[PDB]
Design a binder for this molecule. Structure first.
Ligand SMILES: Nc1ncnc2c1ncn2[C@@H]1O[C@H](COP(=O)(O)OP(=O)(O)CP(=O)(O)O)[C@@H](O)[C@H]1O
Ligand code: NA
Ligand code: NA
Lengths: 298, 255, 937
């Protein structure tokens, strides 16, 4: 349960490890979304009562953004050299700096893209991924025109809330919009948030293609890990995840469109997301002597 | 179809009420938008005057069929409509109706500028027996019908040069047409026109055409062609519009 | 023509084709033979020359009316230019405009139909038909196209035959030759010559048929065009409803056209003008392209659900998948991940644990017990699963195994605990093998024991724990055979209740040393008519392996409960394991109790339990065989959560028929040859795309590309968004008919100059033609779609009186008033104020009145009036079209001489025609009609 700073290779990234009992068991790497931080993205979920069954059996890490979580040093000129392809490839040094064999990463939004790119670059350090609201596609021009033409005068927190939460969800505040808006405004500073958003706006198209039965063995670049795609049924990223659900090997990937949720499934519906993660991990040979949830409480 | 032969199963009253309210709301929106659009328009001069750039020409009275005047020198009921229309039209031109109007110098545009906008006088005596002062019948009884040729009013149009209406008979020019005043000279003191609201009591210039049917050629069909001659401003040649600076009519006086 | 290799013995096959009949030809030889013959499954049909498909769109339907109108205009201009010198170039331009209208309409129809055709043809390439061949010693599965004449092909149960095979090795293959011989009764296939006619012998299996029992091996002799098959050569309710609606609206359009033609003739129209007005007001009113729009909607939804791993085989499955009210699913593979790991054992009278991480033996136990030795030997021997010869450095559990998931789990467990399963099988040679069958529920094998005290024959058995204990007379405890008694049997049942109560699949293992005096070294062992003592075996122990539910399955069952879909679990596993899994995934939700549960909550016998107090039941398969037809109805009508345990694949048909007698729309799951009648009787037949037989994929109406139950529910949700998007398209098709017919009515009534002519009526119809298609292309989703009870397709109509009252009278009227506003403003800014226009129709339109006075005193000739009228007509058309497109965009954003569009204080344009739209979308919102077409505001 200590906070560690990795060696300055193409930048420095702050990580937080909750323990090192694994030896051989994989760890649970994490990567938050744009404008957020681990204390606001995964802390509200890993401390859940139903998640204690998993947290006590795996080492949980928390890889923050190339910016900062506590304080706001920022950069004078900014110079956001580490892009998503650059951010993904700085993870193997992090793993070698903590003696981590392999990670079961779980990323939200841009963190999901970073983990996917890291898995594509190094399909041996990751055993499985939980891609929440993943978007392996560039903005193109069709939505790029609407992202800036009608939003020339738009605050960055409004842009982040539009990216995360659904249209009606932000239209009608349920005090969750207020809580996460104050989380965005305070804590993490605006400069690094804007820099991260600008870096993420590029989002070069991830190379993934669904294997065809016996013909495309010559060219195929689909993930080799057990994938669990999570997205709320009332979020603006549903189409992105369905696009990622396609062009992905339907033998190991899983698509979960949760019914009564939308926006951030990790905080709105934690009790179902933790059950899904437990079932996803249990089929990988892990936590075998666990309890099947909903079995009449026992 | 049915016991009552209708579909009014306690319905058709609620439907009627709902559509009454919906169309009342829609009509209210439409009427308010129309009113608020009309408030942006002038009451004295059109917003756009580029669709009526040049004056047309027209004849009076309007016949029943096309522009074909037909009557008989004998029957007074054949040309009663012509007489009544000519007398009704020329009433505001008479001596007792132009008394309030003013007298303007000839051969110059009466460019008024100021909230008075007096109108000059067109003396009905300029028509020279094509008015009703000599004979109540405008030459129809005598066999020499009189027809008025008018230039369409355009707000702010100032003709250049010396406007004139040139009517030439096409029926071998045997019934030589008589044009009044003079040779159809349109005077410049009636121009420009300042609108129905500003130019109160405005009387436009008239040209009267009398075709004299001799007994030898009575019963023919004289085709007369008039044009706005003498003013380069006012167009008279156009393929599509046959009445732009022109008018053609046929007069047939049955024996 | 026979020309076959039936009577030609095996030696010539090695010569006639140059392939050795134990390893098949090499990859290079296979490719070389493929290069000169072509793909195996060619069977190419002809196609339409693709210009007939465009000529039919041009000259077809109501485009013939516009062609007739153009011909009439050209004839009128011809007679005009003949009789009169220097004619008016008006009929010529009118004919050219009509011709352009038909051309553009045909182009839209063509590039709307040859996009749905592309989407629908994309699906046929998603699941290529494959084949198992033996090239370069090992078996490599390839596309059936790559199969060539002369290679070795293996076929098994539920396998479509890649091509004509000369069978050289077979144990029990029975092909379904109904495709050629007509009779569907399976015919056995053997490697020997049996009949002169190729179609009647037993050593040849024909192309496009499938072997339905057992396995066989053959040499491909004929490919697609040379095969025996290559040598030989219904309306959905939505379609019927839309066809009826189109016919009714077409009749309405023709009536309106006739009445307007007569009225225009009354208003002094020329005959050539009135005829064109008729053919324009008919064409603009019939719903052209409505069938194309619904085809686009269906194909788009089929494409979008295929992205979610639901592959429909036809567009009728798309509309049926939205009306689902029951889903009969299978536990293993569909509701569970089918990735099992051994976690408990029970051989002695104690439950022994197991664990990964080879070191320390895993928890605390090792090979000390001879009972464990025997149990591990049975598990290793009876398995058919083999590690794929690769990834040796990888961990034993983290490997790749070919076989059943249970057999794979057993193999991995034995390799981790004992090790050297391959050498263990080498020591005990397999004399005869009885494959696992869902009807038998056990796997039997006989092996040779090199042991010292061996009776020279060892019998190995595994299968259902209770079907194995019914033929076991002794229980092996600490290596000592003890008689099977009620002291051990109740302990066995308690162990089953504990291991099975955790949702763990349990298998029973038993053996019997076949006596030597009864079974000598060379005793006859034949699979058919078995002679070994299957009864009276020696029970050894149980092994339980966890099979976790799929991650997205509990949420999917929650969605099904939110909707009115009744999920039924049909499984062959034990009632204990089935009930535990059903409770775990939420099929039996908390609160619901079985009869055996309410007999235990309050201690009374089962016979005293009131059946109506239980809404959840677990029905054994044997208890279903003796049920009458009316007795199954009591199960399905009164119980809201039903589990069918120990149910054979041939009782799925009974279950589906019983569900369909309840007036339900049943979606059933199958992955075998025996499931085919259920997959065809069910309203939606769902086949597993990963581990499903070719026979099931032929019988199914839909293929699960990931074998995931949650994908079925996602496809149901996607197909539910097909009627709300269809009535939207119908309404958008109907909204433009009032802006086109109201100008003439107001013309007649108010006697104003004509607001819209019959060239801009067709221009409005042309501009606002693709709006419904673009609407359903940009349609995102809905919100409460899965909180809505299933559609009743028989008694729920796509078109009701509220949709028609909406389109024809609330949206169309708003658009018409916007166009009228544009017309009024254009006229008023040229001098003719709105109050002046009333009654001006007769002075206007009179070619001989060339001094018509406006509101400002000016006087207009006929042509000067008509230029402004033409401007008003074009502005009306532009306003209608632009506002329709802008309203489309705004509606998809807010909720989930062409004067218009001008900036110079032109709020008369699309600005107001859309401002009335947005001002009435709020009043219809506030009034809040609940029964709710407040949408389409
Ligand atoms: N390879 C195998 N060898 C021997 N017995 C097997 C076996 N696979 C399964 N069994 C046993 O036979 C029983 C019958 O299984 P069956 O094929 O009828 O349904 P299933 O349990 O295999 C999958 P589902 O529940 O989806 O139908 C199983 O419950 C299991 O106990
Ligand atoms: Na049409
Ligand atoms: Na129409």
């Amino acid at each position: 349960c200590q906070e560690h700073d990795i060696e300055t290779t193409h930048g420095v990234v702050h990580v937080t490890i909750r323990g090192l009992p694994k030896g051989n068991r994989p760890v649970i790497l994490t990567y938050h979304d744009i404008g957020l931080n681990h204390k606001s993205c995964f802390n509200a979920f890993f401390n859940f009562e139903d998640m204690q069954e998993i947290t006590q059996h795996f080492a949980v890490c928390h890889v923050d953004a190339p910016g900062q979580q506590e304080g706001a040093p920022s950069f004078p000129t900014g110079y956001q050299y580490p892009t998503m392809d650059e951010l993904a490839e700085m993870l193997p040094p992090v793993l070698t700096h903590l003696s981590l064999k392999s990670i079961i990463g779980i990323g939200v939004g841009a963190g999901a893209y970073i983990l996917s790119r890291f898995a594509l670059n190094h399909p041996e350090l990751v055993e499985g991924l939980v891609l929440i609201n993943v978007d392996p596609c560039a903005k193109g021009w069709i939505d790029w025109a609407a992202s800036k033409l009608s939003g020339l005068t738009t605050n960055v927190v409004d842009i982040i809330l539009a990216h995360h939460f659904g249209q009606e969800e932000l239209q009608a505040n349920l005090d969750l919009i207020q809580t996460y808006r104050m989380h965005i405004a305070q804590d993490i500073n605006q400069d690094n948030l804007q820099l991260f958003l600008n870096s993420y706006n590029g989002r070069r198209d991830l190379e993934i293609e669904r294997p065809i039965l016996g013909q495309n063995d010559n060219k195929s670049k689909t993930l080799k890990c057990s994938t669990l795609l999570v997205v709320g049924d009332n979020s603006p990223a549903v189409e992105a995840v369905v696009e990622c659900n396609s062009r992905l090997n339907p033998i190991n990937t899983t698509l979960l469109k949760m019914a009564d949720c939308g926006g951030l499934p990790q905080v709105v519906q934690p009790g179902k997301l933790t059950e899904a993660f437990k079932y996803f991990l249990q089929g990988m040979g892990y936590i075998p002597s666990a309890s099947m949830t909903r079995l009449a409480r026992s | 179809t049915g016991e009552f032969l209708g579909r009014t199963a306690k319905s058709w009253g609620l439907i009627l009420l709902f559509y009454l309210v919906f169309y009342g709301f829609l009509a209210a929106l439409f009427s308010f938008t129309m009113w608020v659009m009309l408030q942006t328009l002038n009451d004295e001069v059109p917003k756009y005057r580029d669709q009526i750039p040049s004056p047309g020409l027209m004849v009076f009275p309007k016949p029943v069929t096309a522009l074909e005047y037909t009557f008989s020198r004998s029957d007074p009921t054949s040309y009663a409509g012509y007489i009544e229309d000519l007398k009704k039209f020329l009433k505001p031109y008479t001596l007792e109706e132009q008394k309030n109007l003013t007298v303007c110098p000839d051969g110059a545009l009466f460019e008024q500028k100021g909230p008075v906008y007096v109108a000059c006088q067109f003396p009905i005596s300029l028509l020279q027996a094509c008015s009703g002062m000599n004979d109540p019948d405008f030459g129809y009884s005598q066999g020499n019908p009189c027809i008025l040729v008018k230039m369409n009013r355009i707000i702010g149009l100032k003709p250049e040069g010396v406007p004139r209406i040139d009517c030439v008979s096409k029926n071998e020019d045997i019934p030589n047409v008589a044009v009044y005043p003079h040779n159809g000279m349109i005077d410049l003191k009636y121009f420009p026109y300042y609108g129905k609201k500003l130019h109160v009591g405005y009387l436009q210039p008239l040209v009267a055409v009398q075709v004299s049917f001799a007994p030898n050629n009575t019963g023919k069909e004289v085709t007369v062609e008039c044009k706005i001659d003498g003013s380069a401003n006012l167009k008279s040649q156009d393929d599509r519009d046959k009445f732009l600076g022109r008018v053609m009519f046929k007069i047939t006086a049955r024996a | 023509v026979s020309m076959d290799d039936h009577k030609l013995s095996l030696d010539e096959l090695h010569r006639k084709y140059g392939t050795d009949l134990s390893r098949g030809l090499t990859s290079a030889r296979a490719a070389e033979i493929l290069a000169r013959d072509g793909p195996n499954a060619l069977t190419p049909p002809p196609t339409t020359p693709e210009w007939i498909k465009f000529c039919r769109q041009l000259f077809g339907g109501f485009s013939m009316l516009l062609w007739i109108g153009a011909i009439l205009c050209f004839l009128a201009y011809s007679i005009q230019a003949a009789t009169e010198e220097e004619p008016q170039n008006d009929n010529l331009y009118l004919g050219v405009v009509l011709s352009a209208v038909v051309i553009i309409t045909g182009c839209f129809s063509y590039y709307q139909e040859a996009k749905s055709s592309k989407i629908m043809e994309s699906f046929k390439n998603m699941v290529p038909q494959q084949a198992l061949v033996i090239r370069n010693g090992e078996k490599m599965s390839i596309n059936a196209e790559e199969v060539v004449v002369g290679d070795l092909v293996e076929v098994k149960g539920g396998d479509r035959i890649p091509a004509d095979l000369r069978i050289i090795s077979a144990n029990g293959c029975k092909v379904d030759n109904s495709s050629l011989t007509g009779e569907s009764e399976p015919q056995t296939r053997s490697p020997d010559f049996t009949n002169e006619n190729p179609l009647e012998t037993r050593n040849i299996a024909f192309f496009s048929t499938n072997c339905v029992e057992g396995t066989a091996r053959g040499i491909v002799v004929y490919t697609g065009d040379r095969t025996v098959m290559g040598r030989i050569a219904g309306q959905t309710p939505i379609a019927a409803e839309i066809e009826h609606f189109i016919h009714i609206i077409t009749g309405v359009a023709v009536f309106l056209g006739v009445s307007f033609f007569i009225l225009s003739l009354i208003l002094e129209y020329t005959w050539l003008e009135a005829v064109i007005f008729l053919i324009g007001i008919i064409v603009a009113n019939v719903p052209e392209g409505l069938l194309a729009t619904v085809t686009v909607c269906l194909t788009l939804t089929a494409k979008r659900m295929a992205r979610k791993n639901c592959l429909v085989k036809n567009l009728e499955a798309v509309e049926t998948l939205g009306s689902t009210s029951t889903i009969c699913s299978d536990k293993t593979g569909t509701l569970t991940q089918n990735r099992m790991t051994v976690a408990h054992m029970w051989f002695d009278n104690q439950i022994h644990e197991a664990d990964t991480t080879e070191n320390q033996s895993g928890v605390s136990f090792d090979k000390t017990s001879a009972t464990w030795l025997a149990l591990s030997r049975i598990a290793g021997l009876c398995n058919r699963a083999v590690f794929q010869a690769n990834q040796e450095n990888l961990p034993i559990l983290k490997r790749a195994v070919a076989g059943d998931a249970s057999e794979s789990a057993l193999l991995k467990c034995i390799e981790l605990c004992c090790g050297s399963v391959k050498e263990m099988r080498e020591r005990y040679a397999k004399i005869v093998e009885i494959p696992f069958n869902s009807t038998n529920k056990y796997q039997l094998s006989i092996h040779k024991n090199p042991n010292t005290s061996e009776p020279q024959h060892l019998l190995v058995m595994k299968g259902a724990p209770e079907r194995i204990l019914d033929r076991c007379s002794s229980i092996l405890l600490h290596g000592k055979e003890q008689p099977l008694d009620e002291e051990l049997k109740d302990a066995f049942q308690n162990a089953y209740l504990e291991l099975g109560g955790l949702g763990e699949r349990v298998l029973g293992f038993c053996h019997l040393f076949l006596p030597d005096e009864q079974f000598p070294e060379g005793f006859q062992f034949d699979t058919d008519d078995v002679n070994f003592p299957i009864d009276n075996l020696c029970f050894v122990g149980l092994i339980s392996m966890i099979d976790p539910p799929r991650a997205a399955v509990p949420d999917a069952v929650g969605k099904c409960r939110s909707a009115g879909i009744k999920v039924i679990m049909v499984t062959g596993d034990h009632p204990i394991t089935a009930k535990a899994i059903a409770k775990g995934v939420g099929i039996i939700s908390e609160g619901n109790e079985t009869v055996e549960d309410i007999a235990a909550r309050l201690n009374i016998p089962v016979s005293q339990v009131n059946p109506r107090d239980a809404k959840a039941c677990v029905v054994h398969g044997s208890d279903l065989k003796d049920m009458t037809s009316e007795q199954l109805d009591d199960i399905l009508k009164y119980h809201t959560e039903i589990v069918f345990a120990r149910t054979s694949p041939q009782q799925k048909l009974i279950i589906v028929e019983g569900c369909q007698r309840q007036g339900a729309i049943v979606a059933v799951t199958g992955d075998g040859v025996n499931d085919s009648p259920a997959l065809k009787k069910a309203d939606i037949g769902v086949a597993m795309g990963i581990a499903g037989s070719d026979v099931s994929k032929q019988a199914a109406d839909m293929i699960l590309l990931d074998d995931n139950f949650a994908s079925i529910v996602t496809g149901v949700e996607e197909g539910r968004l097909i009627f709300d998007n269809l009535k939207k398209s119908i309404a958008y098709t109907l909204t433009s008919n009032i802006p086109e017919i109201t100008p003439f009515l107001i013309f007649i009534i108010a006697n104003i100059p004509l607001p819209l002519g019959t060239v801009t009526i067709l221009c409005i119809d042309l501009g606002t033609d693709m709006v419904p298609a673009i609407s359903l292309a940009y349609e995102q989703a809905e919100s409460d779609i899965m909180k809505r009870q299933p559609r009743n397709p028989k008694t729920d109509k796509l078109v009701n009186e509220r949709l028609i009252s909406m389109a024809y009278g609330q949206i169309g009227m708003i658009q018409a008033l916007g166009g009228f506003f544009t017309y009024f403003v254009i006229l008023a800014e040229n001098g003719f104020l709105p109050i002046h226009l009333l009654g001006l129709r007769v002075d206007w339109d009179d070619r001989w009145i060339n001094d018509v006075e406006d509101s400002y005193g000016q006087q207009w000739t006929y042509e000067q009036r008509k230029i402004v009228e033409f401007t008003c007509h074009t502005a009306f058309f532009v306003s209608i079209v632009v506002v329709q497109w802008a309203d489309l965009v705004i509606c998809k954003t807010r909720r989930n001489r062409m004067y218009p569009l001008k900036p110079t204080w032109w709020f008369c344009a699309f600005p107001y025609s859309l401002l009335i739209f947005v001002y009435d979308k709020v009043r219809k919102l506030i009034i809040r009609r609940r029964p709710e077409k407040e949408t389409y505001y």
